Scaffold this active site. Structure first.
Site, PDB file in Angstrom:
ATOM      1  N   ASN B   8       0.866  -1.167   0.000  1.00 16.49           N
ATOM      2  CA  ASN B   8       0.000   0.000   0.000  1.00 16.49           C
ATOM      3  C   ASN B   8       0.904   1.218   0.000  1.00 16.49           C
ATOM      4  O   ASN B   8       1.540   1.524   1.016  1.00 16.49           O
ATOM      5  CB  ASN B   8      -0.928   0.003   1.209  1.00 16.49           C
ATOM      6  N   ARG B  89      -2.606  -2.248  -3.349  1.00 20.55           N
ATOM      7  CA  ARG B  89      -3.839  -1.501  -3.169  1.00 20.55           C
ATOM      8  C   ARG B  89      -3.833  -0.314  -4.113  1.00 20.55           C
ATOM      9  O   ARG B  89      -2.853   0.423  -4.171  1.00 20.55           O
ATOM     10  CB  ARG B  89      -4.009  -1.022  -1.729  1.00 20.55           C
ATOM     11  N   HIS B 178     -13.598   1.685   0.517  1.00 19.92           N
ATOM     12  CA  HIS B 178     -13.549   0.566   1.454  1.00 19.92           C
ATOM     13  C   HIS B 178     -14.028  -0.734   0.807  1.00 19.92           C
ATOM     14  O   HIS B 178     -14.435  -1.674   1.513  1.00 19.92           O
ATOM     15  CB  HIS B 178     -14.377   0.847   2.716  1.00 19.92           C
ATOM     16  N   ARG B 239     -13.456  14.289   8.452  1.00 20.45           N
ATOM     17  CA  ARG B 239     -14.256  14.503   7.257  1.00 20.45           C
ATOM     18  C   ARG B 239     -15.704  14.740   7.647  1.00 20.45           C
ATOM     19  O   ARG B 239     -16.244  14.051   8.518  1.00 20.45           O
ATOM     20  CB  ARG B 239     -14.135  13.306   6.307  1.00 20.45           C
ATOM     21  N   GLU B 380      -7.877  -6.220   5.321  1.00 24.00           N
ATOM     22  CA  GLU B 380      -7.753  -5.882   3.906  1.00 24.00           C
ATOM     23  C   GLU B 380      -6.548  -6.563   3.266  1.00 24.00           C
ATOM     24  O   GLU B 380      -6.630  -7.024   2.117  1.00 24.00           O
ATOM     25  CB  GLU B 380      -7.709  -4.359   3.750  1.00 24.00           C
TER      26      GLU B 380
END
Ligand code: ANP
Ligand code: ANP
Lengths: 361, 395
Positions: B8, B89, B178, B239, B380
């Protein structure tokens, strides 16, 4: 017994009512019964062819939980809130002053599109922005169509013969403007328009809610000005933007029936946006007893109502085709647990009832 | 039997895991951070040991070289030939990628093409892919896209009510993110229940510093709360999630904010941090709330409400609900957040078992509840490694 005038001011709509029965004695705009300030040409025709006046006011902020008698102070704070509704409030208050002088004997009441929603709790009206956008600038959900939602939810209680506070209600005002409102214990506890009447569900030309990060992107990739973004959100989207045909629900419907693919998607999306909101308010209220449809679309479109109510057996909500087809007052299936009503909104009568309650107790 | 690496790449970071497949055993993991900047740090952990060092790391090229040398230099691998595949990713797959892809010359151009949308992530992701092909040329690689799982959404869910042009010409529409976590934990839920996902109506809540909800019906995502960008949907650490769009032109007019400032407002100054004024971290806001901070308590309450509103939307879209999944940093650990989120849902037959919920047991619904409620740890890198097995090593 009583004669009440309902006012809505580049225009001046009017409706003179015989209360408390609510019989329309005339209506017009700037004149009908059963070309060429302009308040004088009105009061002229009245004669050449009054107990109180009620005035629609677009924004009442956190200051008015309810309609208010018209004095100079309440006029003071109406003109103050122009900082939030700057193209509507100032000539609503000008209309209040023109009836304050030309017709000085008459008590007047101000009716605010926002007042009904001032029972929202902070979890429902605070946006997840830095605190100071609310506390220093007043940015929060306010909600609109308050008079309409207030009127039809009350009318629904009356028709069912129970206290409105006994019901969990979702009310959908669907016209060129569109909003949904959740009413529990007789109080609005949520509603889909926000800081301005632009947001919430998809409408005739308004987008409603969208991913906010689209807007900075549009600024940088198309150099959109604040004006341009605003025009995009209010005048170019909704049924008109998606369909590319019309802002009017029935014109879009006709194009989708003749094969237009963007039109059909417009109708499909329109229904989805409302269904998602209903779902949120059912969740928030912990159930549903009744769902109301009103406005030019809610009262008249069997198709929009059928599409909005599909596949909701998990709520005990389904429609009766024959009843929906006639726009009957109650359209739910005979074995349904949720009442579904089609109620014609009458905001001038709601305004007239406030002039009675507050000016002639 | 098989040695798979999950990678990643961030604008100044490089996260990695080495897994023994197909059992999913973690061999090692770590992070190289502040690449190009001062205070660059290389952390590498195994089951037994940790190693950490601040040293200058110039570009991502140097970070990969240091990582590969450490695998052998620390005895983890006999040799780099021991590595059987690498999974990357990738932030944004557009409408092009409905699934994970074998890395080739052509996958990289399409990833670089999609940079117009995810601008601060897809170019570095592709850099990471190109560096590994260069330094590990014999090892097959797979790109795993945060968006692919949501490509089964219908148009009345991914179209925004804007003018058609904005989608047909500028690519603006809901994509959702996600994807790999929602995929992973819903598939794991079906496994734990011993029923096929196709049999369930699932709502999945990934609640971390980023938060998103996803509705999974018939084994397919049919909606999710992030949209054009990972900024939107529910409230998050910093956020805002969805807000009234007409606020942005107002703030441009009133405060004169540029495009970049609007986006920092939405992404870095809002959420729990903006409301609480305390922290972006759930635990810190909860600590401040219980000591009397009314803004902090309101932040925790508004966070719960936004998630509940989204669940409500997705339960109605599917016509009911059979299971609810919590995961991510907050979903997996905060029994309080789960209780506030799940309260007063008798109209769905959903209620929590307080004992099980305080323990974060795997299933926390009440004895007579009709809806399954699971607390599942998302993995993940495990999901990615399984995509590498599936595509590069059909076996
Ligand atoms: N028979 C019908 N079938 C479907 N749609 C209809 C029908 N009759 C009217 N409409 C729609 O209903 C709309 C009426 O809007 P209307 O409710 O009068 O304004 P409004 O909702 O108050 N606008 P706003 O105050 O800004 O929210 C029209 O614009 C039509 O598109
Ligand atoms: N025991 C705990 N109780 C409550 N909250 C916790 C606990 N442990 C961690 N958290 C919260 O969990 C969050 C961490 O989320 P995390 O999953 O690590 O981020 P993320 O999912 O990677 N964000 P994103 O970049 O969108 O993927 C923080 O906000 C912490 O406050």
């Amino acid at each position: 017994t009583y004669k009440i005038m309902a006012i809505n001011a580049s225009s001046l709509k009017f409706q003179l009512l015989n209360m408390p029965q609510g019989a329309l004695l005339c209506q017009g705009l700037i004149l009908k019964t059963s070309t060429l300030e302009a308040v004088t040409l009105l009061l002229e025709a009245l004669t050449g062819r009054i107990d109180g006046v009620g005035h629609r006011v677009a924004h009442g902020g956190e200051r008015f939980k309810d309609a208010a008698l018209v004095c100079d102070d309440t006029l003071r704070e109406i003109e103050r809130l122009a900082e939030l509704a700057p193209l509507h409030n100032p000539v609503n208050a000008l209309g209040i002053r023109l009836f304050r002088q030309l017709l000085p004997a008459v008590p007047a009441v101000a009716v605010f599109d926002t007042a009904f929603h001032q029972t929202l709790a902070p979890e429902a009206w605070l946006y997840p922005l830095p605190w100071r956008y609310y506390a220093e600038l007043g940015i929060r959900r306010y909600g609109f169509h308050g008079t309409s939602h207030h009127y039809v939810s009350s009318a629904l209680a009356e028709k069912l013969g129970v206290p409105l506070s006994a019901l969990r209600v979702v009310s959908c005002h669907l016209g060129n403007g569109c909003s949904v409102c959740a009413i529990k214990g007789g109080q609005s506890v949520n509603t889909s328009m926000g800081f301005t009447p632009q947001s919430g569900v998809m409408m005739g030309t308004r987008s409603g809610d969208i991913d906010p990060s689209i807007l900075p992107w549009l600024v940088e990739k198309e150099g959109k000005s604040a004006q341009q973004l605003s025009q995009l959100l209010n005048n170019e989207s909704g049924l008109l933007g998606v369909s590319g045909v019309s802002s009017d629900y029935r014109d879009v419907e006709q194009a989708a029936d003749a094969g237009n693919e963007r039109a059909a998607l417009a109708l499909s999306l329109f229904a989805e946006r409302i269904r998602a909101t209903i779902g949120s308010y059912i969740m928030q209220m912990g159930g549903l007893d009744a769902l109301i449809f009103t406005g030019g679309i809610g009262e008249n479109s069997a198709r929009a109502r059928a599409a909005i109510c599909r596949n909701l057996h998990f709520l005990g909500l389904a429609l009766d085709d024959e009843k929906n087809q006639r726009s009957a007052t109650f359209i739910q299936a005979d074995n349904a647990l949720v009442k579904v009503a089609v109620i014609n909104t009458n905001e001038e009568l709601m305004i007239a009832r406030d002039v009675m309650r507050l000016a002639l107790p």
